[PDB]
Amino acid sequence: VYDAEFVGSEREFEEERETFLKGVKAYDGVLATRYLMERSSSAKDEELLELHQNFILLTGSYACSIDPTEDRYQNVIVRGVNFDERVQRLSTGGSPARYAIVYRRGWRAIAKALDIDEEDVPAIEVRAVKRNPLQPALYRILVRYGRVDLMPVTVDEVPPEMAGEFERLIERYDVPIDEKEERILEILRENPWTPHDEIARRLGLSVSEVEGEKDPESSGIYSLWSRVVVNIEYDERTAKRHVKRRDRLLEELYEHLEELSERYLRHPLTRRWIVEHKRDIMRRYLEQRIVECALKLQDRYGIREDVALCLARAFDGSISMIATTPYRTLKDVCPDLTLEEAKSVNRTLATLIDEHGLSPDAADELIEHF
Numbered sequence: 001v002y003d004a005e006f007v008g009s010e011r012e013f014e015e016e017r018e019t020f021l022k023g024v025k026a027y028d029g030v031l032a033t034r035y036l037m038e039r040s041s042s043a044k045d046e047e048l049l050e051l052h053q054n055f056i057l058l059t060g061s062y063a064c065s066i067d068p069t070e071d072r073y074q075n076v077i078v079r080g081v082n083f084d085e086r087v088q089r090l091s092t093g094g095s096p097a098r099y100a101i102v103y104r105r106g107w108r109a110i111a112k113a114l115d116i117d118e119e120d121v122p123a124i125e126v127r128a129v130k131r132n133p134l135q136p137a138l139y140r141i142l143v144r145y146g147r148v149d150l151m152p153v154t155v156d157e158v159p160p161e162m163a164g165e166f167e168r169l170i171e172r173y174d175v176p177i178d179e180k181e182e183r184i185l186e187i188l189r190e191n192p193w194t195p196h197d198e199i200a201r202r203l204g205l206s207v208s209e210v211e212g213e214k215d216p217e218s219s220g221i222y223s224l225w226s227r228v229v230v231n232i233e234y235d236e237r238t239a240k241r242h243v244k245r246r247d248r249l250l251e252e253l254y255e256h257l258e259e260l261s262e263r264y265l266r267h268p269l270t271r272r273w274i275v276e277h278k279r280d281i282m283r284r285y286l287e288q289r290i291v292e293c294a295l296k297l298q299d300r301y302g303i304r305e306d307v308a309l310c311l312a313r314a315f316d317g318s319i320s321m322i323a324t325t326p327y328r329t330l331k332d333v334c335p336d337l338t339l340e341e342a343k344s345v346n347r348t349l350a351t352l353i354d355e356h357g358l359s360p361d362a363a364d365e366l367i368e369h370f
Contacts, residue, residue: 002108008072023062029055289317
């Protein structure tokens with residue numbers, strides 16, 4: 001289930017909606033730009049890319065403004081888990097709403113708390129990896145801690161130490177780093193935009209072990225960045241300049257899109273055209289996401305072709321969702337899955353059975369109920 005009720009006031013309600021709607025508009029810009037990029041290699045053009053990344057920045061910016069008093073929502077569930085209690089028992093607390101939205105399809109709970117009915121499938125996602133102008137993990141953490149100040153609004157504003165030189169920021173604050181984090185940092189030094197599953201696979205870890213809790217007291221890359229960000233004192237002044245700047249940026253970015261679109265496709269890409277082909281566009285990305293995932297499962301995890309496509313389909317092309325799923329669920333939706341296959345893609349499963357001697361069932365509910 002996906003759910004959340006609005007407990008804020010009426011003034012706060014129409015602020016949220018207004019923040020959400022602008023975010024939805026920003027993320028549509030990400031979808032539209034990606035559609036263009038994948039229509040020639042000559043397109044995959046730095047102007048386009050930069051326009052794409054400015055959209056990622058604005059989506060991220062609005063996303064940071066959600067629940068600014070950190071008390072406007074309650075009972076926030078994303079795929080069953082209750083993010084309220086979770087966020088309560090974390091040293092640094094925070095907004096369960098913003099916490100949610102960093103998860104894939106987490107926006108649905110906030111979608112139901114407000115009554116977003118303007119365009120269908122009103123997604124806001126803040127999970128871009130390979131084209132994100134920021135160090136991806138940091139980008140997500142900024143959203144979690146609602147750092148409107150720190151989140152850049154244009155690509156040219158993006159400081160090196162928040163992208164390819166991310167380590168400078170970590171080191172510029174006097175933050176401790178455990179052994180597991182050092183190993184993770186070593187991979188991001190080669191390529192800061194390495195996906196987390198790929199980092200996991202290489203280090204012999206699970207995605208959760210790589211990520212850690214989005215709190216300084218945990219261990220992992222989310223944890224490390226949480227540790228950094230809470231020692232960066234807030235700059236209410238820059239938050240103001242950002243918040244006041246962006247609505248106009250957003251509009252020129254769309255105008256940029258229409259103009260620049262003509263260089264590739266004969267039917268110009270308008271704001272209206274994006275709203276009216278919302279479904280088909282995402283269906284397009286879901287297809288790619290499924291093909292890639294099947295390809296990855298077969299080649300990188302050694303999974304037979306039929307089963308790969310089966311899992312790829314059941315979990316809408318998200319390997320991290322496959323990896324963190326219980327064997328029982330995995331096997332229900334893909335009858336022919338073998339245990340070795342499941343262990344090959346679920347490190348937690350593998351670590352519980354192999355190193356700890358548990359049965360499938362016992363690992364399965366450790367996996368569910370952490």
